[PDB]
Design a protein around this motif. Structure first.
Motif, PDB file in Angstrom:
ATOM      1  N   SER A 277       0.829  -0.863  -0.080  1.00  0.00           N
ATOM      2  CA  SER A 277       0.330   0.028   0.522  1.00  0.00           C
ATOM      3  C   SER A 277       0.642   0.830   0.099  1.00  0.00           C
ATOM      4  O   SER A 277       1.158   1.904  -0.663  1.00  0.00           O
ATOM      5  CB  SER A 277      -1.016  -0.206   0.873  1.00  0.00           C
ATOM      6  OG  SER A 277      -0.299   0.436   2.306  1.00  0.00           O
ATOM      7  N   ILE A 278       2.094   1.025   0.968  1.00  0.00           N
ATOM      8  CA  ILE A 278       3.206   2.191   1.102  1.00  0.00           C
ATOM      9  C   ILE A 278       3.307   2.534  -0.318  1.00  0.00           C
ATOM     10  O   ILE A 278       3.526   4.027  -1.022  1.00  0.00           O
ATOM     11  CB  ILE A 278       3.200   2.364   1.521  1.00  0.00           C
ATOM     12  CG1 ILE A 278       3.298   2.654   3.433  1.00  0.00           C
ATOM     13  CG2 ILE A 278       4.457   2.816   1.620  1.00  0.00           C
ATOM     14  CD1 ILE A 278       4.565   2.811   4.097  1.00  0.00           C
ATOM     15  N   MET A 279       4.457   1.423  -0.884  1.00  0.00           N
ATOM     16  CA  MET A 279       4.779   1.598  -2.419  1.00  0.00           C
ATOM     17  C   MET A 279       4.136   1.743  -3.517  1.00  0.00           C
ATOM     18  O   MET A 279       4.174   1.850  -5.019  1.00  0.00           O
ATOM     19  CB  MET A 279       6.088   0.429  -2.635  1.00  0.00           C
ATOM     20  CG  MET A 279       6.779   0.702  -2.048  1.00  0.00           C
ATOM     21  SD  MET A 279       8.615  -0.048  -2.322  1.00  0.00           S
ATOM     22  CE  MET A 279       8.950   0.987  -4.484  1.00  0.00           C
ATOM     23  N   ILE A 285       7.464  10.520  -1.147  1.00  0.00           N
ATOM     24  CA  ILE A 285       6.757  10.713   0.462  1.00  0.00           C
ATOM     25  C   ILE A 285       7.664   9.791   1.246  1.00  0.00           C
ATOM     26  O   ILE A 285       7.158   9.558   2.035  1.00  0.00           O
ATOM     27  CB  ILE A 285       5.002  10.630   0.494  1.00  0.00           C
ATOM     28  CG1 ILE A 285       4.944  12.076   0.940  1.00  0.00           C
ATOM     29  CG2 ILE A 285       4.545   9.624   0.553  1.00  0.00           C
ATOM     30  CD1 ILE A 285       5.445  13.735   0.608  1.00  0.00           C
ATOM     31  N   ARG A 286       7.578   8.372   1.081  1.00  0.00           N
ATOM     32  CA  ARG A 286       7.644   7.297   1.441  1.00  0.00           C
ATOM     33  C   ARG A 286       7.786   7.580   2.930  1.00  0.00           C
ATOM     34  O   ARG A 286       8.145   6.545   3.814  1.00  0.00           O
ATOM     35  CB  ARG A 286       7.997   6.178   0.703  1.00  0.00           C
ATOM     36  CG  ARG A 286       6.703   5.414  -0.470  1.00  0.00           C
ATOM     37  CD  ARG A 286       7.323   4.062  -1.457  1.00  0.00           C
ATOM     38  NE  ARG A 286       8.474   4.152  -1.266  1.00  0.00           N
ATOM     39  CZ  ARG A 286       9.050   4.269  -2.764  1.00  0.00           C
ATOM     40  NH1 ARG A 286       8.026   4.492  -3.850  1.00  0.00           N
ATOM     41  NH2 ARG A 286       9.368   4.100  -3.438  1.00  0.00           N
ATOM     42  N   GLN A 310       6.985  -5.375  13.471  1.00  0.00           N
ATOM     43  CA  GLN A 310       8.794  -4.792  12.497  1.00  0.00           C
ATOM     44  C   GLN A 310      10.084  -5.433  12.320  1.00  0.00           C
ATOM     45  O   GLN A 310      10.136  -5.275  10.721  1.00  0.00           O
ATOM     46  CB  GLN A 310       9.676  -3.860  14.378  1.00  0.00           C
ATOM     47  CG  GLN A 310      10.286  -3.200  14.015  1.00  0.00           C
ATOM     48  CD  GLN A 310      11.116  -2.821  14.902  1.00  0.00           C
ATOM     49  OE1 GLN A 310      10.560  -2.614  16.201  1.00  0.00           O
ATOM     50  NE2 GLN A 310      12.115  -2.348  14.954  1.00  0.00           N
ATOM     51  N   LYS A 311      10.126  -6.383  12.713  1.00  0.00           N
ATOM     52  CA  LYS A 311      11.112  -7.237  11.932  1.00  0.00           C
ATOM     53  C   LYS A 311      10.745  -7.773  10.290  1.00  0.00           C
ATOM     54  O   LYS A 311      11.084  -8.303   9.604  1.00  0.00           O
ATOM     55  CB  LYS A 311      10.778  -8.829  12.889  1.00  0.00           C
ATOM     56  CG  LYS A 311      12.780  -8.804  13.824  1.00  0.00           C
ATOM     57  CD  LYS A 311      12.404  -8.555  15.074  1.00  0.00           C
ATOM     58  CE  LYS A 311      12.677  -8.326  16.274  1.00  0.00           C
ATOM     59  NZ  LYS A 311      12.741  -7.607  17.441  1.00  0.00           N
ATOM     60  N   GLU A 312       9.097  -7.651  10.394  1.00  0.00           N
ATOM     61  CA  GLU A 312       8.549  -8.697   9.564  1.00  0.00           C
ATOM     62  C   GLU A 312       8.183  -7.415   8.470  1.00  0.00           C
ATOM     63  O   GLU A 312       8.904  -8.015   6.861  1.00  0.00           O
ATOM     64  CB  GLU A 312       6.777  -9.065   9.518  1.00  0.00           C
ATOM     65  CG  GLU A 312       6.806 -10.484   8.901  1.00  0.00           C
ATOM     66  CD  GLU A 312       7.661 -11.031   7.973  1.00  0.00           C
ATOM     67  OE1 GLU A 312       6.181 -10.131   7.185  1.00  0.00           O
ATOM     68  OE2 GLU A 312       7.408 -12.389   7.970  1.00  0.00           O
ATOM     69  N   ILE A 313       8.676  -6.073   8.540  1.00  0.00           N
ATOM     70  CA  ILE A 313       8.518  -5.295   7.761  1.00  0.00           C
ATOM     71  C   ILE A 313      10.151  -5.151   7.222  1.00  0.00           C
ATOM     72  O   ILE A 313      10.341  -5.279   5.967  1.00  0.00           O
ATOM     73  CB  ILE A 313       7.774  -3.803   8.105  1.00  0.00           C
ATOM     74  CG1 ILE A 313       6.137  -3.770   8.409  1.00  0.00           C
ATOM     75  CG2 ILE A 313       8.396  -2.740   7.615  1.00  0.00           C
ATOM     76  CD1 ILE A 313       5.827  -2.722   8.404  1.00  0.00           C
ATOM     77  N   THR A 314      10.677  -4.965   8.278  1.00  0.00           N
ATOM     78  CA  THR A 314      11.959  -4.566   7.806  1.00  0.00           C
ATOM     79  C   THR A 314      12.247  -5.516   6.939  1.00  0.00           C
ATOM     80  O   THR A 314      13.731  -5.266   6.119  1.00  0.00           O
ATOM     81  CB  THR A 314      13.578  -5.022   9.235  1.00  0.00           C
ATOM     82  OG1 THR A 314      12.558  -4.174  10.155  1.00  0.00           O
ATOM     83  CG2 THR A 314      14.607  -4.135   9.140  1.00  0.00           C
ATOM     84  N   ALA A 315      12.227  -6.622   6.676  1.00  0.00           N
ATOM     85  CA  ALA A 315      13.248  -7.845   5.535  1.00  0.00           C
ATOM     86  C   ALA A 315      12.467  -7.260   3.809  1.00  0.00           C
ATOM     87  O   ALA A 315      12.385  -8.010   3.493  1.00  0.00           O
ATOM     88  CB  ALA A 315      12.477  -9.169   6.226  1.00  0.00           C
ATOM     89  N   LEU A 316      10.519  -7.055   4.265  1.00  0.00           N
ATOM     90  CA  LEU A 316      10.491  -6.541   3.210  1.00  0.00           C
ATOM     91  C   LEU A 316      10.716  -4.996   2.729  1.00  0.00           C
ATOM     92  O   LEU A 316      10.586  -4.353   1.374  1.00  0.00           O
ATOM     93  CB  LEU A 316       8.778  -7.011   2.930  1.00  0.00           C
ATOM     94  CG  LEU A 316       8.046  -6.515   2.007  1.00  0.00           C
ATOM     95  CD1 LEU A 316       8.081  -7.466   1.019  1.00  0.00           C
ATOM     96  CD2 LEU A 316       6.339  -6.657   2.109  1.00  0.00           C
ATOM     97  N   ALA A 317      10.944  -4.212   3.792  1.00  0.00           N
ATOM     98  CA  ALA A 317      11.106  -3.073   3.422  1.00  0.00           C
ATOM     99  C   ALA A 317      12.653  -2.706   2.563  1.00  0.00           C
ATOM    100  O   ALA A 317      13.194  -3.436   2.763  1.00  0.00           O
ATOM    101  CB  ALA A 317      11.088  -2.057   4.683  1.00  0.00           C
TER     102      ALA A 317
END
Ligand SMILES: Nc1ncnc2c1ncn2[C@@H]1O[C@H](COP(=O)(O)OP(=O)(O)O)[C@@H](O)[C@H]1O
Ligand SMILES: Nc1ncnc2c1ncn2[C@@H]1O[C@H](COP(=O)(O)OP(=O)(O)O)[C@@H](O)[C@H]1O
Ligand SMILES: Nc1ncnc2c1ncn2[C@@H]1O[C@H](COP(=O)(O)OP(=O)(O)O)[C@@H](O)[C@H]1O
Ligand SMILES: Nc1ncnc2c1ncn2[C@@H]1O[C@H](COP(=O)(O)OP(=O)(O)O)[C@@H](O)[C@H]1O
Ligand SMILES: Nc1ncnc2c1ncn2[C@@H]1O[C@H](COP(=O)(O)OP(=O)(O)O)[C@@H](O)[C@H]1O
Ligand SMILES: [Mg+2]
Ligand SMILES: [Mg+2]
Ligand SMILES: [Mg+2]
Ligand SMILES: [Mg+2]
Ligand SMILES: [Mg+2]
Lengths: 367, 367, 367, 367, 367
Positions: A277-279, A285-286, A310-317
């Protein structure tokens, strides 16, 4: 003379005047007719119990949620929720105020009309305004920026807002939590012989969802050690005599929130929908959509998040990005603490729709 | 002009006007024809004595109960019970009132019709209503909730009622007390030489059931010490000269109520039928089905219960549950004190079936 | 050297070698201890009769079904079923084969383990495999697609399978047929005075379910005309002398299958659960889930279905859709005609679990 | 036009019209032929004297009783009794009335027929009815309940009657008093040298039975002191010159009524037969069969009874039971005071058998 | 070294070793003291004659049955029966064997104790076992199933047994045959002038019951034609000179067995007790309880039954049921041919009570 902020969710309906704390009144928002015939005079027995009594006298009723996955099923029950509430609860006149209502972000209109209109002709609240439930959740911590992840029974939303405008096209809505979480728990509790088939009793499942829950941090490896004799099981006791001992699945069930293959629905987990959703915003702006996820609802009460998230996003971010995932306590009332601030604040009173302006266009103009 | 609540049990038929105390008239409900030829002119002698005289002049009759294990045997005797009662006892006209009758909860229809109809054409009470016998037993202490254990000669029932509707399918009916308790006592009294063959004499057995009885608390362990010389035997004296000394079995016979293997019947004891009827309700409600067993009938007069019933249930029941087993004194008239309250109360008078409405449907509509 | 497909239902257990017709051996699957003391030497009398003799010598026993509503009650009786079967019936060695077992689709594990394990160390069948009971029912008419409605005493299931994968989450399991149908018939037969209290005697009730039954097509309108004098009643004769005449209720009792309010359970009828299971699948596939309901079990033997089921679905189903309800004759053995085909077929032999692979993991890996 | 109640005993035949006092005519009921040749012209002498003259002219006759121990010996003499009585005494026509006769309770039928018929064809009394001698003894003091002990020469009976039907099977009949008492007295008077061989002279013995008699209270202890010189002997004078002084045996002889071993008959005394007849009734009734022994006949004239009977019974009877032994004065006519009351009373006149109803059945129908 | 099966009935006591034919010794089981004084030196005269000589020398005795209607009156006479039998008849030592005794099925305990004990301390038979008199009657023709109607003077019983356990509670015991039949015959024989007052003479009555008897097939209609002059009377001759001619009542007296109103007892006839005992079993078993009545005793020697019994039952029994009423010849020894088979048979020898096991418990344990 007050104004009233009343939020209809699939809750846990909340009602309390224009400020300043939390809803004066909260109840499970259910109507339930008695599935049997009554025979002790009066007639005493009601044609249908609304909350809260319809949550105190389960088992002899058939709970029917008046709203369901955002769109409501029928206003015959909904209106009765309303009439009951305004007249015999808050002890507030119908002509007391111009009101403030909430909806889902993308609920099929006219699901806002029939409400606005029936409530308009019956209750004659001389004006109206409906702010979307996601936007209000920012007014909690009083931020201007951020992606709002608001998941309550039974519709979540991920609405990104910058300072101060809000990107409309970057919002993804998942029909996941929470009735699907209740139902999944009820489906996996059968693994240990407990049968929770009937409508009323389903409520009890929700309570074992309440207390006995936690999301792991590394599921795949944790499942192994779960099999070890060391009990990750806590035994809850059920309203009758029965003592129920649930473990393992206790942390398995909420995990469904990510990796929702377990349900048999294809849309990928909140994990991935947040990023994706963010990208879908503009590249520049991200930077500030990250490090400002402010969570809300009653489904971010698990002791797992946010560092699971957190740990989940940081792997995908993308790499080299700092991500605070600030989420308040008290979140269950976050939305309301939003709404209260709003109608008391200048000056959007004049973007309302009063009565004179409902004789001209009517059912339109609402958007 | 009064209205009359009249309950037919295998009693002890009870009759008394719409309140407010207890039945005006109570009698053992028997007709018995004279098994011999009479020769003392007049003709003087009656064709058949109804109660109460048929209980004062036993031995010269063959007692024949007009009803037997719920369903009545023949209305030839039953109607005669009725006519004799209304005309030569209570001194009440037939058109005096609309009446109120009781039945068993699951008595084979049309065992209610033939009654309702015969009484309708013969006695012409301009209306009618039949309320089930278990339900009325709650109106005594005026509770609204609870599982009712109503056991009288000769059909017991276990009806669970919540506030205020009543669960139909959670009721189990045992053809146990009380003629089987009488007959069983007569069968286990034979071991000490006492022969009780004649129909009339059986009544005497019932009286030894009355005074000389008590339910133990721990039977299996009590039986050992029963063998000890210390008399747990009380010697009763019999209408003629004879002095009868029964012990041991004095507490054995009533114990049959639980563990009815002694009779040679497979249906498990009242012990188990109470619980097994209770967990046939919905899981959430049980908390208040417990701790409100209100007993009734004439077979809950033993000085054993309820702490027998208590200790026994608590062993089968789930743990950590508080179980009051409240059963009044005066219980013999409990049902009746119920009925009086009902037909006198507003407003269910308009749930009756009067004469004009028996011209349309007739034999149906009664339910 | 053959391999044996043995399915445990609450039947009517079925056993017969890897093809090709029907079970070599079928029997009612009961153990019953003698509720009395025996006194004619030998000792002659067995400690407990298993089927079939436990169905030839009722009344002097207390029949106890080793399994009950899916989950079995205790392996003490179950194992005796097994041992008796393998050793003194089929005359087959324990090391003869790798075996094939069935279960319910969502039976509480470990209800599959304790079986698999006890059978593994006691009977030492060098391998194992358990296929779910619904899946096998498709192999009858040898179809690859369809929603399978398999209802036998005492657990029904609704499993939708496409070609060739099977949707796991679209299955709803109702605890309805068949002991509830037997017990309900026994409960509504009391309305005409017939008492069917004893455990053994319940079997006779089941037989009146067999021959004397039919599901109506338009119940609501049919009930009125049922009251008309023209007998829709057939008079059956009972193992002793008695002749029992059941009418009206003869078609009322099975109708419980739909509208299961009569039982006092809230889960909606098979009518609605079929549809509600189907539209819990993906929208595109529904076209072929319809027009391919293949029924099975022993409770789809009523002369009512399937066009009762049909008219019922077409009222609930979307319009403009052709809905075939193909259900074979011989359905009572459908599942078995499935299983036999499977273990004889290549190649899932190598999806088995042999002994060497039970020394490593054991209680796990079974699923 | 009156009706006549006539009782045949082995008496002392009694005759008197339908009320209201006592028999008009009483006489010893004997025919006696002259055992010698007569030679004093006329020829004058009668072929046979009936009573009473045959009791005035003993010694020149051979007394022959027409009846003997219930069954009469021959109707040749009996008819002569009758004809003589009706025609040359009461001066009553034969067609005057319908008559009423008594018999023993268990006299061998047809010992009632030959009477009924012979008197029917000879004397043509247009109707008939025969009431048993025991039942009538209740009609004296006009009680409704009780065991009647009626002992007259020469058949006693013990009939228990409740209100108002009568137990038939609880009666034991002993062939005891009174010719056996006369003969016994004559058998023990030889003990003091007095020879009483001749039939006629036996009458005199009966008279010494009359005045000089009394039943002791405690025989065994009385016998000792009887031997003491103190005269318990009273001296009677005999119709000729002789003066006979009897003592001792004077009270011993009647005692034979209890303890009838003295005769050489094993059937136990009236003492025991009363009780043994009573406990051949129903257990409930005994309470009032006791305390209502009403005696009758001419052998309950002894000054010993009834408190002899009392002290004897209370020792044999169960304890704590009140036992009235009510016996009137005037008892000798008790039976007759019955009959008068009967045939004068409405309405059993229509339980008679007239002539029109004797051409159909005849010898039957009498019972 | 043999073992002895000895059955005490109110017979006709039977004794003979462990097989294989019939009792070695049979006699009428009476003691009789001489009611007179003896004067012929020696002292010569015995203190009391037991059978059989006490059946050869009636009239000089007062016959006293040591047992009477099941429970014995006193062990003083009974022990003399025993001692006389073992010592001066069978020529058997007391320590020869472990013995086998029979009783009634529901004889008041401890009526078995006082026997078991007195015989144990006096006669010192090193073991013991008591089997009920009804059960043994099945071992005659060696069936395993059936309802047994065992009627001997003076207690009949109806014990239903299935294969192979025995229903205890379905037995009804009537205190009927045979002393009531003897006494009734004596009570109705008086009707023709025959006086049978003394106890000794009663034996002769029993003999006229033997030969001159037969039960009709349709009584009520048979009596009409019985009145016809054609003699259904056979003339028996009596030990002295007297010739007695009995008719009518010859078939009436035994008929009392059904329809026992004639006696004045309310319990309905064997007719009804057979059926009413049968439908006191479980509904399924009745099919084979019918068609297998195996009769025994000495009261099934009448030439009337069983097609009397048959026509009687078929009218009361349900329709469409086949009813064989198999009763052997030689039946008088049936029970005994039972006992012989038992103690000779393996293996119930180890269900005995020996010497070592009577020092621990004693008076108990016998059951
Ligand atoms: N402490 C808790 N832990 C887990 N889940 C909770 C907790 N409290 C509430 N919930 C869940 O949150 C839901 C209520 O969310 P809510 O904020 O009322 O959503 P809405 O406002 O859209 O109705 C309930 O369905 C409940 O299952
Ligand atoms: N004190 C007592 N102890 C034991 N049983 C009693 C007592 N009093 C009455 N009973 C029994 O209770 C029965 C009456 O019960 P009742 O309440 O009249 O039943 P129903 O109302 O169904 O006829 C009688 O048959 C009697 O045997
Ligand atoms: N002709 C029939 N009509 C109606 N029901 C039947 C008939 N035959 C058998 N049944 C029912 O079907 C059931 C047997 O189903 P079954 O296939 O054995 O189920 P499972 O395999 O799960 O045990 C029995 O309980 C019986 O009541
Ligand atoms: N005072 C007396 N004492 C003893 N016996 C008497 C007395 N008076 C009469 N009797 C006896 O009573 C008998 C008459 O009694 P009754 O009532 O006529 O007997 P039944 O009715 O049997 O003929 C006579 O045989 C006589 O011996
Ligand atoms: N042929 C017969 N006809 C009728 N009655 C008989 C016959 N033989 C014997 N009886 C009667 O039956 C009785 C014998 O029964 P029995 O089998 O000896 O009973 P038990 O064995 O219990 O003593 C005897 O008392 C006799 O009066
Ligand atoms: Mg929401
Ligand atoms: Mg009742
Ligand atoms: Mg199945
Ligand atoms: Mg007399
Ligand atoms: Mg016997």
């Amino acid at each position: 003379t007050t104004a009233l902020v009343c939020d209809n969710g699939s809750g846990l309906v909340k009602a309390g005047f224009a400020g300043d704390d939390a809803p004066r009144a909260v109840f499970p928002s259910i109507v339930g007719r008695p599935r049997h015939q009554g025979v002790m005079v009066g007639m005493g027995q009601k044609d249908s119990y609304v909350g809260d009594e319809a949550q105190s006298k389960r088992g002899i009723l058939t709970l029917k949620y008046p709203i369901e996955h955002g769109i409501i099923t029928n206003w015959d029950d909904m209106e009765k929720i309303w009439h009951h509430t305004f007249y015999n609860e808050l002890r507030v006149a119908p002509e007391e105020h111009p009101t403030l209502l909430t909806e889902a972000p993308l609920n099929p209109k006219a699901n806002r009309e029939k409400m606005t209109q029936i409530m308009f002709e019956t209750f004659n609240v001389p004006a109206m305004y409906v702010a979307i439930q996601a936007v209000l959740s920012l007014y909690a911590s009083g931020r201007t920026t951020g992606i709002v992840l608001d998941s309550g029974d039974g519709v979540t939303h991920n609405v990104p807002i910058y300072e101060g405008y809000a990107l409309p096209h970057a919002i993804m809505r998942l029909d996941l939590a929470g009735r699907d979480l209740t139902d999944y728990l009820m489906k996996i509790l059968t693994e240990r012989g407990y049968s929770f088939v009937t409508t009323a009793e389903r409520e009890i499942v929700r309570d074992i969802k309440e207390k006995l829950c936690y999301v792991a941090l590394d599921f795949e490896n944790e499942m192994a050690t779960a099999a070890s004799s060391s009990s990750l099981e806590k035994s809850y006791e059920l309203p009758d005599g029965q003592v129920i001992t649930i473990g393992n699945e206790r942390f398995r069930c909420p995990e469904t929130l990510f990796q929702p293959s377990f349900i048999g629905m294809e849309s990928a987990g909140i994990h991935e929908t947040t990023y994706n959703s963010i990208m879908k915003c503009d590249i520049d702006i991200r930077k500030d959509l990250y490090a400002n996820n402010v969570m809300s609802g009653g489904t971010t009460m698990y002791p797992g998040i946010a560092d699971r998230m957190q740990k989940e996003i940081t792997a995908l971010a993308p790499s080299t990005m700092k991500i605070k995932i600030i989420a308040p306590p008290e979140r269950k009332y976050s939305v309301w603490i939003g709404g209260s601030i709003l109608a008391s604040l200048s000056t959007f009173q004049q973007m309302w729709i009063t009565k004179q302006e409902y004789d001209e266009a009517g059912p339109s103009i609402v958007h």
